[PDB]
UniProtKB/Swiss-Prot annotation:
Residues 20-113 form the HPt domain. It comes from Escherichia coli (strain K12). Activation requires a sequential transfer of a phosphate group from a His in the primary transmitter domain, to an Asp in the receiver domain and to a His in the secondary transmitter domain. Member of the two-component regulatory system ArcB/ArcA. Sensor-regulator protein for anaerobic repression of the arc modulon. Activates ArcA via a four-step phosphorelay. This is Aerobic respiration control sensor protein ArcB. It is found in: Cell inner membrane. The modification Phosphohistidine is found at residue 59.
């Protein structure tokens, strides 16, 4: 059930048919190199209590993750960039830490899925 929950399987299956696995795996390699810096910027903005900085970085990750089918990371970045939500002030530091702790795992789950599908 982890593949279904963390990845966008319909999008990935259509992508495999249209482009093949190489564009997905190359995109994923770029995502892995940029994510350490994206999460560090989220954290430094959280410390500075810079709301615009946090929302801007959330939006960048949302797009980045959605491009490679990381549906749950995309949903976290959607929540991070949504200060209109009643729970935002209470939970944005929790969603930041959740992202920090899990993104490498979510990348390993997509790598395995692409390996099995191909
Ligand atoms: Zn999570």
């Amino acid at each position: 059930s982890k593949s279904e929950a963390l990845l966008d399987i319909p999008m990935l299956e259509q992508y495999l048919e249209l482009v093949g696995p190489k564009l997905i795996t190359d995109g994923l390699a770029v995502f892995e190199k940029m994510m350490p810096g994206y999460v560090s910027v989220l954290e430094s903005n959280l410390t500075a209590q810079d709301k615009k900085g946090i929302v801007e970085e959330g939006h960048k990750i949302k797009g980045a993750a959605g491009s490679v089918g990381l549906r749950h990371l995309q949903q976290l970045g959607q929540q991070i960039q949504s200060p209109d939500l009643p729970a935002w002030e209470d939970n944005v530091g929790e969603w930041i830490e959740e992202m920090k702790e899990e993104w490498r795992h979510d990348v390993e789950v997509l790598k395995a899925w692409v390996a099995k599908a191909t």
